[PDB]
Amino acid sequence: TPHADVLDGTSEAREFATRTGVSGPVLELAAGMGRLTFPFLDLGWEVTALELSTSVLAAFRKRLAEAPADVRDRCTLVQGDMSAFALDKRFGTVVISSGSINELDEADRRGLYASVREHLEPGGKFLLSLAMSEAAESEPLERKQELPRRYVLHVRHLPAEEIQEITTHRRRLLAPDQVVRELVRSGFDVIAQTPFASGGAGRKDMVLVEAVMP
Amino acid sequence: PVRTPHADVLLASVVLCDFYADGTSEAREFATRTGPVSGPVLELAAGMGRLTFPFLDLGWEVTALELSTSVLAAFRKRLAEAPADVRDRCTLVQGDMSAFALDKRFGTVVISSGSINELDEADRRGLYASVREHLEPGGKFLLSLAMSEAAESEPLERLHVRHLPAEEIQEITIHPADEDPFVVCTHRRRLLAPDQVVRELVRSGFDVIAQTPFASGGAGRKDMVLVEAVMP
């Protein structure tokens, strides 16, 4: 990097619950060590938590052992891949967090959408949270050109993907509008996009997306 | 087709359609950055020769690779109306820029902004690997890449945090200035930040040895970058 050469999930979980209103289990994709799962469990939800890593699942399992029996009993841990999974069970609600979807490239996101399709019951809901950068939230500047019959050309540049760079690590930052376009492209109907503040106060910096299958 | 905010307002106050040779300054930049040229040049996704004919005008032997049979036919028609010396130096080949294989290697391989931007991430990977396999030792891969205002600007730094441009969508709405029939043409296409393609080239094993911004209209704002890449 140019500089180096010179040198809590509660609020997010509540937002999912707002756009849920839940009979039966919820499938949470790439649940990690339960940063959102534990909040979900405190809402009385029955959660099937899918996580790829053996090491992360150990941490999740340990934290569940420290939880009360009533909480632990409502969580089912399953080892598996968010971009390619098969549980043979369908679900009323399927959930994925911003950090998780942003770990997937273009092809793997298609894998994700298709996998979700196979795990949604009729009329089921696919819910996503998506980090929204300053560039993603702003209205694109439209630029005019008069050119010869005379025509007017209007040009806009819509955000699609950025890189979040820290000082060394880069991470993918997708525009919520980009993921929405992909969801439509994969067959889903996106019925709601709700901006919210990830920490529960201040500027809105995330979008909660509701997608359903026609 | 694409139903842009401005198009919607236009059609309300007034037909919607999707929108779908003068890259002289662009071809010039390719020539400037190449240096030499000692040997044949491979031009990927040459279309109808928007750059190929300028290249042939510089004396180059060019192998022009193009996917579409109809575009190739129209290229052949243009090549048949060119003088024998020009025609004899151009070799047309049907192929896919994201996965091609020829019985030839080249000292220079070139691709235009419009063409690489038609490829998704996985297909760009296929492009980068294919190009490697077709470069002679010391050969160079030259790319032009359109550069948006957001791509050109220094990212706003807010531990240090930056948000780097990677990909945008270029949206155009074209209509007559008069305001029957009133046709409003729209289109959406991929626009990669030049620095994103550079990062991908490096990841694929290339050394990016120069990036030179330039104006595609030979004048005005520099709206394009000429990237030079070689194998280590």
Short mmCIF file of C-alpha atoms in Angstrom, two decimals:
data_model
loop_
_atom_site.label_atom_id
_atom_site.label_comp_id
_atom_site.label_asym_id
_atom_site.label_seq_id
_atom_site.Cartn_x
_atom_site.Cartn_y
_atom_site.Cartn_z
CA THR A 1 0.00 0.00 0.00
CA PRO A 2 1.11 3.63 -0.65
CA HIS A 3 1.00 4.40 3.10
CA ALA A 4 3.01 1.34 4.24
CA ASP A 5 5.89 2.25 1.90
CA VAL A 6 5.89 5.75 3.42
CA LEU A 7 5.81 4.32 6.96
CA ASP A 8 -21.72 -6.63 18.48
CA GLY A 9 -24.42 -8.10 16.27
CA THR A 10 -27.54 -7.21 18.30
CA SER A 11 -28.73 -4.21 16.23
CA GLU A 12 -28.10 -5.97 12.92
CA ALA A 13 -29.99 -9.03 14.19
CA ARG A 14 -32.91 -6.85 15.32
CA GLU A 15 -33.06 -5.43 11.80
CA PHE A 16 -33.41 -8.95 10.35
CA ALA A 17 -36.22 -9.57 12.87
CA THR A 18 -37.98 -6.34 11.85
CA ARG A 19 -38.15 -7.51 8.24
CA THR A 20 -39.15 -11.01 9.38
CA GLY A 21 -42.14 -10.57 11.71
CA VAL A 22 -41.16 -16.63 12.03
CA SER A 23 -42.83 -19.99 12.28
CA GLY A 24 -40.22 -22.75 12.08
CA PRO A 25 -36.41 -22.80 11.84
CA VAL A 26 -34.22 -20.14 10.26
CA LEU A 27 -31.18 -21.05 8.19
CA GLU A 28 -28.23 -18.73 8.80
CA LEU A 29 -25.47 -18.98 6.20
CA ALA A 30 -21.79 -18.67 7.22
CA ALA A 31 -22.73 -18.11 10.86
CA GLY A 32 -19.11 -17.88 12.06
CA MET A 33 -19.00 -18.21 15.85
CA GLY A 34 -22.54 -16.85 16.28
CA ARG A 35 -22.04 -13.07 16.19
CA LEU A 36 -25.60 -12.87 14.82
CA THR A 37 -26.78 -16.37 15.88
CA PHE A 38 -26.73 -15.59 19.59
CA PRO A 39 -28.79 -12.40 19.11
CA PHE A 40 -31.16 -14.47 16.89
CA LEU A 41 -31.50 -17.10 19.63
CA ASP A 42 -32.35 -14.35 22.14
CA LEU A 43 -35.30 -13.48 19.88
CA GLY A 44 -36.60 -17.03 20.49
CA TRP A 45 -35.66 -18.15 16.97
CA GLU A 46 -34.80 -21.75 16.17
CA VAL A 47 -31.61 -21.45 14.10
CA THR A 48 -29.74 -23.86 11.87
CA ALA A 49 -26.28 -22.27 11.69
CA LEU A 50 -24.13 -23.25 8.71
CA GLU A 51 -20.34 -22.64 8.98
CA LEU A 52 -17.45 -23.98 6.82
CA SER A 53 -14.48 -23.92 9.20
CA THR A 54 -13.71 -26.71 11.67
CA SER A 55 -11.76 -24.23 13.85
CA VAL A 56 -14.55 -21.60 13.90
CA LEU A 57 -17.17 -24.28 14.62
CA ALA A 58 -15.12 -25.31 17.69
CA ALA A 59 -15.34 -21.73 19.03
CA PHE A 60 -19.10 -21.67 18.27
CA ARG A 61 -19.57 -25.02 20.04
CA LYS A 62 -17.62 -23.76 23.09
CA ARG A 63 -19.71 -20.56 23.31
CA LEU A 64 -22.91 -22.66 23.05
CA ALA A 65 -21.74 -24.84 25.97
CA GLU A 66 -21.47 -21.61 28.00
CA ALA A 67 -25.04 -20.60 27.04
CA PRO A 68 -28.16 -21.75 28.95
CA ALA A 69 -29.68 -25.08 27.85
CA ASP A 70 -32.77 -23.34 26.43
CA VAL A 71 -30.59 -21.26 24.09
CA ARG A 72 -28.22 -24.08 23.09
CA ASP A 73 -31.13 -26.47 22.37
CA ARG A 74 -32.53 -24.07 19.75
CA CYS A 75 -29.27 -23.98 17.76
CA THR A 76 -28.31 -26.66 15.24
CA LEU A 77 -24.72 -26.41 13.98
CA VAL A 78 -24.02 -27.80 10.50
CA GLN A 79 -20.61 -27.78 8.78
CA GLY A 80 -20.88 -26.54 5.19
CA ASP A 81 -20.18 -24.00 2.45
CA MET A 82 -22.44 -20.94 1.91
CA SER A 83 -21.68 -20.94 -1.85
CA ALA A 84 -22.44 -24.67 -2.30
CA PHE A 85 -24.53 -26.49 0.32
CA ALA A 86 -27.17 -29.23 0.56
CA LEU A 87 -29.12 -29.98 3.75
CA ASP A 88 -32.09 -31.73 2.06
CA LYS A 89 -34.36 -29.58 4.25
CA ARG A 90 -36.19 -26.45 3.15
CA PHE A 91 -36.67 -23.39 5.37
CA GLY A 92 -39.17 -20.56 5.84
CA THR A 93 -36.38 -18.02 6.31
CA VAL A 94 -32.78 -17.92 5.00
CA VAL A 95 -30.32 -15.32 6.37
CA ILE A 96 -26.84 -14.04 5.37
CA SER A 97 -24.76 -11.16 6.77
CA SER A 98 -22.79 -8.49 4.84
CA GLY A 99 -19.34 -9.74 5.88
CA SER A 100 -20.22 -13.21 4.64
CA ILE A 101 -21.58 -12.40 1.17
CA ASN A 102 -18.70 -9.98 0.58
CA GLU A 103 -16.27 -12.94 1.01
CA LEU A 104 -17.66 -14.47 -2.21
CA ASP A 105 -16.61 -13.65 -5.76
CA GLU A 106 -19.01 -13.31 -8.72
CA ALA A 107 -19.27 -17.04 -9.50
CA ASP A 108 -19.55 -18.10 -5.85
CA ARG A 109 -22.39 -15.59 -5.26
CA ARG A 110 -24.33 -17.30 -8.08
CA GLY A 111 -23.67 -20.59 -6.29
CA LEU A 112 -25.05 -19.00 -3.11
CA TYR A 113 -28.24 -17.71 -4.81
CA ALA A 114 -28.90 -21.08 -6.46
CA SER A 115 -28.25 -22.97 -3.21
CA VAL A 116 -30.70 -20.69 -1.32
CA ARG A 117 -33.29 -21.30 -4.07
CA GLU A 118 -33.17 -25.04 -3.26
CA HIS A 119 -33.51 -24.48 0.50
CA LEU A 120 -36.45 -22.07 0.47
CA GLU A 121 -39.96 -23.39 1.08
CA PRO A 122 -42.76 -21.93 -1.10
CA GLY A 123 -43.17 -18.24 -0.22
CA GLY A 124 -39.99 -18.40 1.90
CA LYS A 125 -37.85 -15.33 2.57
CA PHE A 126 -34.17 -14.74 1.72
CA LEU A 127 -32.78 -11.90 3.84
CA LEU A 128 -29.44 -10.17 3.35
CA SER A 129 -27.59 -7.37 5.11
CA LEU A 130 -25.24 -5.35 2.89
CA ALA A 131 -22.68 -2.73 3.94
CA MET A 132 -23.27 0.58 2.16
CA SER A 133 -20.29 2.85 1.50
CA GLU A 134 -20.39 6.61 0.86
CA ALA A 135 -20.01 5.91 -2.87
CA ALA A 136 -22.81 3.30 -2.84
CA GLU A 137 -25.32 5.59 -1.09
CA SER A 138 -24.67 8.75 -3.14
CA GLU A 139 -26.62 9.79 -6.22
CA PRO A 140 -24.37 9.39 -9.29
CA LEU A 141 -23.36 12.63 -11.02
CA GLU A 142 -25.08 12.74 -14.42
CA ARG A 143 -23.04 14.33 -17.23
CA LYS A 144 -24.49 15.85 -20.43
CA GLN A 145 -23.03 16.00 -23.95
CA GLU A 146 -24.52 17.66 -27.03
CA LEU A 147 -23.45 15.85 -30.22
CA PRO A 148 -24.40 15.94 -33.95
CA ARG A 149 -29.60 15.49 -36.30
CA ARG A 150 -28.57 16.70 -32.84
CA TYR A 151 -28.63 14.33 -29.87
CA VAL A 152 -28.17 14.67 -26.13
CA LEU A 153 -26.08 12.02 -24.38
CA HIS A 154 -26.50 11.54 -20.61
CA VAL A 155 -23.81 9.49 -18.81
CA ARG A 156 -23.95 8.14 -15.24
CA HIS A 157 -21.53 5.83 -13.43
CA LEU A 158 -23.30 3.50 -11.00
CA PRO A 159 -21.37 1.94 -8.10
CA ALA A 160 -20.89 -1.83 -8.30
CA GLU A 161 -17.80 -2.90 -6.35
CA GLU A 162 -15.10 -1.26 -4.24
CA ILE A 163 -12.09 -2.44 -2.26
CA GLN A 164 -11.91 -1.52 1.40
CA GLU A 165 -8.22 -1.04 2.17
CA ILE A 166 -6.76 -0.86 5.68
CA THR A 167 -3.29 -0.04 7.05
CA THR A 168 -2.08 -4.60 5.05
CA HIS A 169 -5.43 -6.06 3.91
CA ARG A 170 -7.92 -5.48 1.09
CA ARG A 171 -11.53 -6.64 1.26
CA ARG A 172 -14.41 -6.68 -1.23
CA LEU A 173 -17.10 -4.07 -0.71
CA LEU A 174 -20.14 -4.61 -2.96
CA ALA A 175 -22.75 -1.91 -3.51
CA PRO A 176 -26.15 -3.07 -2.20
CA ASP A 177 -27.65 -2.11 -5.59
CA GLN A 178 -25.18 -4.50 -7.30
CA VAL A 179 -26.20 -7.47 -5.13
CA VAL A 180 -29.88 -6.60 -5.80
CA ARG A 181 -29.22 -6.70 -9.59
CA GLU A 182 -27.59 -10.13 -9.12
CA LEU A 183 -30.54 -11.41 -7.05
CA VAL A 184 -32.99 -10.42 -9.82
CA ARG A 185 -30.67 -11.98 -12.43
CA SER A 186 -30.75 -15.28 -10.48
CA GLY A 187 -34.57 -15.38 -10.45
CA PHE A 188 -35.44 -13.74 -7.12
CA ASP A 189 -37.93 -10.94 -6.55
CA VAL A 190 -36.46 -8.21 -4.33
CA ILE A 191 -39.47 -6.71 -2.52
CA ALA A 192 -37.65 -4.50 0.01
CA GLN A 193 -34.36 -2.68 0.50
CA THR A 194 -34.18 -0.96 3.89
CA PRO A 195 -31.17 1.18 4.86
CA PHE A 196 -30.25 1.08 8.56
CA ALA A 197 -27.42 1.87 11.00
CA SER A 198 -25.44 -1.32 11.72
CA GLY A 199 -24.62 -0.14 15.27
CA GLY A 200 -28.22 0.92 15.89
CA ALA A 201 -27.69 4.69 15.92
CA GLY A 202 -26.37 7.47 13.69
CA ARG A 203 -25.83 7.45 9.94
CA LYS A 204 -27.30 4.57 7.97
CA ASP A 205 -24.45 2.45 6.59
CA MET A 206 -26.11 -0.86 5.70
CA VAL A 207 -29.10 -2.17 3.70
CA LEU A 208 -31.45 -5.00 4.69
CA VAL A 209 -32.60 -6.78 1.52
CA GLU A 210 -35.71 -8.98 1.38
CA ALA A 211 -35.88 -11.43 -1.52
CA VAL A 212 -38.64 -13.91 -2.33
CA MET A 213 -39.08 -16.59 -4.97
CA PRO A 214 -41.94 -16.11 -7.50
CA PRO B 1 -34.36 -2.64 -22.31
CA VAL B 2 -32.84 -0.62 -19.42
CA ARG B 3 -35.33 1.87 -17.99
CA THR B 4 -33.10 4.73 -16.76
CA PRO B 5 -34.44 7.46 -14.40
CA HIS B 6 -33.92 10.14 -17.08
CA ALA B 7 -35.47 7.96 -19.83
CA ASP B 8 -38.60 7.40 -17.70
CA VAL B 9 -39.08 11.16 -17.24
CA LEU B 10 -38.48 11.75 -20.98
CA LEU B 11 -40.92 9.09 -22.20
CA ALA B 12 -43.51 10.46 -19.75
CA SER B 13 -43.23 14.04 -21.05
CA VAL B 14 -43.07 13.01 -24.72
CA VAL B 15 -39.99 4.68 -27.79
CA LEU B 16 -37.48 2.95 -25.48
CA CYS B 17 -34.62 1.02 -27.12
CA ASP B 18 -31.21 -0.35 -26.20
CA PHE B 19 -28.41 1.59 -27.93
CA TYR B 20 -27.03 -1.69 -29.32
CA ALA B 21 -14.18 4.09 -36.62
CA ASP B 22 -12.07 6.77 -34.94
CA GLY B 23 -9.77 5.41 -32.25
CA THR B 24 -6.90 7.21 -33.99
CA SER B 25 -5.62 8.68 -30.71
CA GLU B 26 -5.90 5.28 -29.03
CA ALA B 27 -3.97 3.44 -31.76
CA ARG B 28 -1.35 6.20 -31.57
CA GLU B 29 -0.91 5.58 -27.83
CA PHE B 30 -0.46 1.86 -28.44
CA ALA B 31 2.22 2.65 -31.06
CA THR B 32 3.93 5.18 -28.75
CA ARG B 33 4.11 2.76 -25.80
CA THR B 34 5.23 -0.28 -27.83
CA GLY B 35 8.46 1.28 -29.12
CA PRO B 36 9.98 -1.16 -31.72
CA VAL B 37 8.07 -2.88 -33.38
CA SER B 38 10.13 -5.92 -34.42
CA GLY B 39 7.61 -8.62 -35.38
CA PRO B 40 3.86 -9.45 -35.69
CA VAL B 41 1.32 -8.07 -33.20
CA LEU B 42 -1.67 -10.00 -31.87
CA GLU B 43 -4.78 -7.82 -31.51
CA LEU B 44 -7.49 -9.40 -29.34
CA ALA B 45 -11.17 -8.80 -30.09
CA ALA B 46 -10.27 -6.69 -33.13
CA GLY B 47 -13.89 -6.31 -34.21
CA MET B 48 -13.87 -4.70 -37.65
CA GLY B 49 -10.44 -3.08 -37.43
CA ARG B 50 -11.20 0.21 -35.67
CA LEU B 51 -7.59 -0.08 -34.42
CA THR B 52 -6.33 -2.74 -36.84
CA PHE B 53 -6.30 -0.48 -39.92
CA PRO B 54 -4.44 2.29 -38.06
CA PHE B 55 -1.99 -0.45 -36.91
CA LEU B 56 -1.50 -1.70 -40.49
CA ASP B 57 -0.94 1.95 -41.50
CA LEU B 58 2.10 1.95 -39.20
CA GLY B 59 3.62 -0.97 -41.13
CA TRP B 60 2.73 -3.64 -38.54
CA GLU B 61 2.05 -7.26 -39.32
CA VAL B 62 -1.14 -7.91 -37.31
CA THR B 63 -2.97 -11.08 -36.38
CA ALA B 64 -6.48 -9.88 -35.57
CA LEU B 65 -8.57 -12.23 -33.42
CA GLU B 66 -12.35 -11.90 -33.37
CA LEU B 67 -15.20 -14.05 -32.03
CA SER B 68 -18.08 -13.15 -34.36
CA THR B 69 -18.28 -14.68 -37.83
CA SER B 70 -20.41 -11.80 -39.13
CA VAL B 71 -18.00 -9.17 -37.78
CA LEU B 72 -15.13 -11.16 -39.37
CA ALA B 73 -16.98 -11.27 -42.70
CA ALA B 74 -17.39 -7.47 -42.58
CA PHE B 75 -13.69 -7.20 -41.67
CA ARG B 76 -12.81 -9.33 -44.75
CA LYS B 77 -14.96 -7.04 -46.91
CA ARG B 78 -13.00 -4.01 -45.64
CA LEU B 79 -9.70 -5.87 -46.10
CA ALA B 80 -10.63 -6.66 -49.72
CA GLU B 81 -11.01 -2.92 -50.46
CA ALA B 82 -7.57 -2.17 -48.98
CA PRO B 83 -4.38 -2.12 -51.11
CA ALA B 84 -2.46 -5.41 -51.48
CA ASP B 85 0.36 -4.31 -49.14
CA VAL B 86 -2.08 -3.62 -46.28
CA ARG B 87 -4.14 -6.79 -46.87
CA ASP B 88 -1.03 -9.02 -47.04
CA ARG B 89 0.09 -7.87 -43.56
CA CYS B 90 -3.24 -8.63 -41.83
CA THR B 91 -4.15 -12.16 -40.70
CA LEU B 92 -7.73 -12.77 -39.56
CA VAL B 93 -8.50 -15.52 -37.04
CA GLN B 94 -11.73 -16.61 -35.37
CA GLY B 95 -11.34 -16.97 -31.62
CA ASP B 96 -12.36 -16.05 -28.09
CA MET B 97 -10.18 -13.49 -26.23
CA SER B 98 -11.01 -15.24 -22.90
CA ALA B 99 -9.81 -18.66 -24.13
CA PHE B 100 -7.76 -18.75 -27.34
CA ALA B 101 -4.89 -20.87 -28.61
CA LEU B 102 -2.79 -20.25 -31.72
CA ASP B 103 0.19 -22.01 -33.28
CA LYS B 104 2.13 -18.74 -32.90
CA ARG B 105 3.68 -16.52 -30.22
CA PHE B 106 4.05 -12.73 -30.45
CA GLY B 107 6.36 -9.95 -29.26
CA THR B 108 3.32 -7.70 -28.71
CA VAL B 109 -0.27 -8.47 -27.69
CA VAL B 110 -2.88 -5.67 -27.47
CA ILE B 111 -6.45 -5.30 -26.19
CA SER B 112 -8.77 -2.29 -26.18
CA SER B 113 -10.78 -1.02 -23.19
CA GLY B 114 -14.17 -1.87 -24.73
CA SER B 115 -13.20 -5.52 -25.20
CA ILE B 116 -11.67 -6.40 -21.81
CA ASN B 117 -14.62 -4.69 -20.08
CA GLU B 118 -16.97 -7.16 -21.83
CA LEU B 119 -15.41 -9.98 -19.75
CA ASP B 120 -16.44 -11.01 -16.23
CA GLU B 121 -13.87 -11.81 -13.54
CA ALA B 122 -13.41 -15.50 -14.48
CA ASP B 123 -13.13 -14.73 -18.21
CA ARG B 124 -10.54 -12.00 -17.56
CA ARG B 125 -8.53 -14.71 -15.74
CA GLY B 126 -8.74 -16.81 -18.95
CA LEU B 127 -7.61 -13.77 -20.96
CA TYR B 128 -4.56 -13.17 -18.74
CA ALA B 129 -3.44 -16.83 -18.90
CA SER B 130 -4.06 -17.08 -22.66
CA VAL B 131 -1.98 -13.93 -23.28
CA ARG B 132 0.93 -15.33 -21.18
CA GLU B 133 0.96 -18.45 -23.38
CA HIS B 134 1.20 -16.31 -26.55
CA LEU B 135 3.97 -13.92 -25.56
CA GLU B 136 7.50 -14.55 -26.80
CA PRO B 137 10.29 -14.08 -24.20
CA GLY B 138 10.42 -10.34 -23.44
CA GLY B 139 7.09 -9.79 -25.22
CA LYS B 140 4.65 -7.14 -23.99
CA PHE B 141 0.92 -7.09 -23.25
CA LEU B 142 -0.60 -3.65 -23.86
CA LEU B 143 -4.05 -2.65 -22.67
CA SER B 144 -6.11 0.51 -22.91
CA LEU B 145 -8.61 1.03 -20.08
CA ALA B 146 -11.28 3.71 -19.73
CA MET B 147 -10.87 5.75 -16.52
CA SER B 148 -13.94 7.26 -14.84
CA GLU B 149 -13.91 10.35 -12.63
CA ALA B 150 -14.19 8.09 -9.54
CA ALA B 151 -11.36 5.89 -10.81
CA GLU B 152 -9.19 8.94 -11.54
CA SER B 153 -9.71 10.63 -8.13
CA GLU B 154 -7.57 9.91 -5.06
CA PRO B 155 -9.73 7.92 -2.59
CA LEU B 156 -10.83 9.82 0.53
CA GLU B 157 -8.88 8.52 3.54
CA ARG B 158 -10.76 8.45 6.86
CA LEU B 159 -5.52 2.79 11.53
CA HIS B 160 -6.11 4.13 8.01
CA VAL B 161 -9.13 3.39 5.79
CA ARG B 162 -9.51 3.81 2.03
CA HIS B 163 -12.25 2.77 -0.39
CA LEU B 164 -10.72 1.94 -3.76
CA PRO B 165 -12.73 1.91 -6.98
CA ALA B 166 -12.93 -1.54 -8.55
CA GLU B 167 -15.97 -1.74 -10.84
CA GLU B 168 -18.72 0.62 -11.93
CA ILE B 169 -21.56 0.43 -14.40
CA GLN B 170 -21.51 2.97 -17.23
CA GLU B 171 -25.07 4.02 -17.97
CA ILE B 172 -25.96 6.07 -21.05
CA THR B 173 -29.25 7.66 -22.11
CA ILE B 174 -29.31 9.12 -25.64
CA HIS B 175 -32.19 11.05 -27.21
CA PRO B 176 -32.60 13.70 -29.95
CA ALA B 177 -32.17 17.31 -28.79
CA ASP B 178 -35.38 18.45 -30.55
CA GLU B 179 -38.16 16.67 -28.56
CA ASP B 180 -41.70 11.81 -33.74
CA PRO B 181 -40.79 9.08 -33.40
CA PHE B 182 -38.83 10.09 -30.29
CA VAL B 183 -36.37 7.24 -29.67
CA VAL B 184 -34.62 7.09 -26.30
CA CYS B 185 -31.60 4.76 -26.38
CA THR B 186 -30.22 3.32 -23.13
CA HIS B 187 -27.43 0.92 -22.20
CA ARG B 188 -25.55 -0.42 -19.17
CA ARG B 189 -22.02 -1.81 -19.36
CA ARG B 190 -19.17 -2.83 -17.10
CA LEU B 191 -16.55 -0.20 -16.36
CA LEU B 192 -13.52 -1.45 -14.49
CA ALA B 193 -11.16 0.92 -12.71
CA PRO B 194 -7.71 0.75 -14.42
CA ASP B 195 -6.12 0.05 -10.99
CA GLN B 196 -8.43 -2.98 -10.56
CA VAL B 197 -7.24 -4.51 -13.88
CA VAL B 198 -3.66 -3.76 -12.79
CA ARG B 199 -4.26 -5.68 -9.49
CA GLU B 200 -5.68 -8.59 -11.50
CA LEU B 201 -2.75 -8.61 -13.94
CA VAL B 202 -0.31 -8.82 -11.00
CA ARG B 203 -2.35 -11.60 -9.37
CA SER B 204 -2.19 -13.53 -12.68
CA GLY B 205 1.63 -13.35 -12.74
CA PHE B 206 2.37 -10.25 -14.85
CA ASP B 207 4.59 -7.36 -13.85
CA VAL B 208 2.80 -4.09 -14.64
CA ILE B 209 5.70 -1.86 -15.68
CA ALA B 210 3.90 1.35 -16.76
CA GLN B 211 0.46 2.99 -16.65
CA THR B 212 0.04 6.12 -18.76
CA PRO B 213 -3.16 8.19 -18.64
CA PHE B 214 -4.23 9.80 -21.93
CA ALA B 215 -7.21 11.43 -23.67
CA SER B 216 -9.13 9.17 -26.06
CA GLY B 217 -10.21 12.17 -28.17
CA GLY B 218 -6.60 13.40 -28.46
CA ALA B 219 -7.76 16.38 -26.41
CA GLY B 220 -9.61 17.22 -23.18
CA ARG B 221 -9.61 15.22 -19.94
CA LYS B 222 -7.38 12.16 -19.84
CA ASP B 223 -10.07 9.46 -19.78
CA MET B 224 -8.02 6.35 -20.50
CA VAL B 225 -4.91 4.52 -19.27
CA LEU B 226 -2.33 2.68 -21.38
CA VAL B 227 -1.04 -0.24 -19.30
CA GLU B 228 2.16 -2.16 -20.16
CA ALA B 229 2.65 -5.63 -18.70
CA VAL B 230 5.35 -8.28 -19.02
CA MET B 231 6.15 -11.71 -17.56
CA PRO B 232 8.87 -11.70 -14.84
#
